[PDB]
Amino acid sequence: KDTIALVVSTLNNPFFVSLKDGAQKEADKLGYNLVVLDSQNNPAKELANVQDLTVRGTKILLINPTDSDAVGNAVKMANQANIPVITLDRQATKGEVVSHIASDNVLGGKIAGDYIAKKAGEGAKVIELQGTAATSAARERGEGFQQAVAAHKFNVLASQPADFDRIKGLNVMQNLLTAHPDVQAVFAQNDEMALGALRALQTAGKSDVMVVGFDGTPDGEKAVNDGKLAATIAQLPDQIGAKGVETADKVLKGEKVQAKYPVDLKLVVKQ
Ligand SMILES: O[C@@H]1[C@H](O)[C@H](O)CO[C@H]1O
Fold first, then answer.
1. Domain coordinates in residue numbering, the chain
2. How many Å from the N-terminal Cα to the C-terminal Cα in the chain?
3. How far is the CA of 239 from the centre of ligand 1 (A)?
4. Which of 9, 10, 12, 15 to mutate to test the pocket of ligand 1 (most atoms within 8 A of CB)?
5. 21 exposed, middle or buried (CB, 10 Å; 0-12, 13-18, 19+)?
6. Strand pairing of 210-215 and 260-263?
7. Could you give the CA distance from residue 116 to residue 123 in angstroms, rounded to a whole number?
8. Which CATH code fits 102-237+262-271?
9. Ligand 1 site: residues with CB under 6 angstroms?
């Protein structure tokens, strides 16, 4: 069996666990050996992961960048080693990439903003918990959210990165809460930060604040169902992973593939 490598940004996020399971199930299906490497959100670790794979007989590299701008050196090393690179979920700003597979994060952010305006009303006072700064996913969701801010005249009280992490999202929201107790709604750029934000609101006794997450992970869907999370934009991580391995197969078989493959989003609300 030919080996396909999957370098994922982190395995400490349910979203990336499902992405890995999607790839594993498709690799099993198509008869490939799948090696999984965790970069642990560290560009230095990511680079070393890629350097080690280029000599393991890896035929194709599926990579989820820890940083869209810094991953360029790793992609270029794969390029020198003649190993095709497919990015999943986040882009690579530099280096040659065969195909990129992800959601429309600009649309995702806009839909989140529109839903908030529908519930909390136009001109609502909002806070935004942004993802890791140098990732295409976070940059795009902020951009889509900025279109909603302008359309619905939201008053953005504060906007700060909590790095797609639940504990950080918790602490950042705790601090912004003390400084802006008049917040009406919060857009968290992933479900982990949205879950952390809910816990901060719980600790602070603020039951009145509407929170919108992003991903539709098991925990995020449970919160929406329990009525704790107002909504989440569901992604299809398992299908981003499957589409990556499927696309890896086509490349290895000499079939040309599209440069971009979108994966649908869906607004998830209770009922
Ligand atoms: O799309 C993914 C998911 O939202 C994850 O939760 C954080 O990283 C983003 O790039």
1. 1-101+238-261, 102-237+262-271
2. 45
3. 14
4. 15
5. middle
6. unpaired
7. 10
8. 3.40.50.2300
9. 13, 15, 89-90, 131, 135, 137, 164, 190, 192, 214-215
Query: How many Cα atoms occupy the beta-carbon half-sphere of 68 within 13 Å?
Result: 16
Instruction: For residue 13, report the distance from its CA to the centre of ligand 1, in Å.
Output: 8
Deposited resolution, Å: 2.0
CA–centroid distance, 165 to ligand 1, in Å, is 10
The experimental technique behind this entry is X-ray
Ligand 1 atom at shortest distance from the alpha carbon of 64: 10
Superfamily (CATH H level) for 1-101+238-261: Response regulator (3.40.50.2300)
Cα atoms in the Cβ-side hemisphere of radius 13 Å centred on 62? 32
Q: Which two tokens stand for residue 9?
A: 């940004």
